[PDB]
């Protein structure tokens, strides 16, 4: 799998037949169709005690890893029942500014999209959560091209270091709190991971309010490579999956 012409999302079904499943992500968020649910409590983001370990180029994107051996960086409340631990964050960006986001809002695409992955602590480890219908909780954050995001610059500078798939670098004392928007207004629906295995274990929480980043901050993302060192260079762009059919599922709004 990849995002290329012959291994793109349109081919994932042959290896991961769940691609054509019942609760696949991402989707289009029809705002007029979304249902305002008043029984939704506000989001609870406790990242004050977060511990980042490193950043790796996995060949499909770059991941920032955190220590999830203790309730250090957690998400609870909202549509969730129980505590969800942060394990990693990554992005999906486009080749141009008119694309990159996975999830869409009234068919509108953003420059990039941030995913904060968390796993349900009653399951013990990430590996066991992916075997559950309520296994994961991902926090979706859209990025638009504007003024620079000071809190994202640390991530941006270390990229020179992980240009190719396989590369990784020490990356401690990173506060995710810096990538959060002002409002925590959200949309929530049942879905999956948006890259193979596409496990239908995720509870999506997409915030209404996007963060803005500079053209230069987004430009460094596009300098990444899918390939490993010493292989023909194929730039890491359009690492996003097209929107899937909603299929009965309903999107609730917390606002």
Residue set of the binding site for Zn(2+): 90, 92, 115
**Binding of residue 73 to Hg ion (CB under 5 A):** no
- The residue among 114 and 251 lying less far from Zn ion, judged by its C-beta, is 114
Known binding-site residues equal: 90, 92, 115, 194-195
Residue 121 tokens, joined:
């602590």
- The residue among 62 and 171 lying less far from Zn ion, judged by its C-beta, is 62
Give the number of other CB atoms < 10 A from CB of residue 164: 17
- The residue among 85 and 115 lying less far from Zn ion, judged by its C-beta, is 115
Compose the 100-129 pattern: x for residues touching Zn ion by CB under 5 A, - for all others.
Answer: ---------------x--------------
3-state secondary structure of 3: coil
Residue nearest to Zn ion (CB): 115
216, 150 Cβ separation under 8 angstroms:
no
**Binding of residue 167 to Zn ion (CB under 5 A):** no
Catalytic residue ranges:
60
d(CA 1, CA 190): 24
Beta carbon of residue 135, minimum distance to Hg ion (angstroms, whole number): 5
187, 251 Cβ separation under 8 angstroms:
yes
Q: For 88-115, give the DSSP string.
A: EEEEEE-SSTT---SSEETTB--SEEEE
**Binding of residue 201 to Hg ion (CB under 5 A):** yes
**Binding of residue 138 to Hg ion (CB under 5 A):** no
Residue 175 tokens, joined:
């506060």
Which residues are near Hg ion by CB under 5 A?
199, 201
């Amino acid at each position: 799998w990849g995002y290329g012409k012959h291994n793109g999302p349109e081919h994932w079904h042959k290896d991961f037949p769940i691609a054509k499943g019942e609760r696949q992500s991402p989707v289009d968020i029809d705002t007029h169709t979304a249902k305002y649910d008043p029984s939704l409590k506000p989001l609870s983001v406790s990242y004050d005690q977060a511990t980042s370990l490193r950043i790796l180029n996995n060949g499909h994107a770059f991941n920032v890893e955190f220590d999830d051996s203790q309730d250090k960086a957690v998400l609870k409340g909202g549509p969730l029942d129980g505590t969800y631990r942060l394990i990693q964050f990554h992005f999906h960006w486009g080749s141009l500014d008119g694309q990159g986001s996975e999830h869409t809002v009234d068919k509108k695409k953003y420059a990039a999209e941030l995913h904060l992955v968390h796993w349900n602590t009653k399951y013990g480890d990430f590996g066991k959560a992916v075997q559950q219908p309520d296994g994961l909780a991902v926090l979706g954050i859209f990025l638009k091209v504007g003024s620079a995001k000071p809190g994202l610059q640390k991530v941006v500078d270390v990229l020179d270091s992980i240009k190719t798939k396989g590369k990784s670098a020490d990356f401690t004392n990173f506060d995710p709190r810096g990538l959060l928007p002002e409002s925590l207004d959200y949309w929530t629906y049942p879905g999956s991971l948006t890259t193979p295995p596409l496990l239908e274990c995720v509870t999506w929480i997409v915030l209404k309010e996007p963060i803005s980043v500079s053209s230069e901050q987004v430009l460094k993302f596009r300098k990444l490579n899918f390939n490993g060192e010493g292989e023909p260079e194929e730039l890491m762009v359009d690492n996003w999956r097209p929107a899937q059919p909603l299929k009965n599922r309903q999107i609730k709004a917390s606002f």
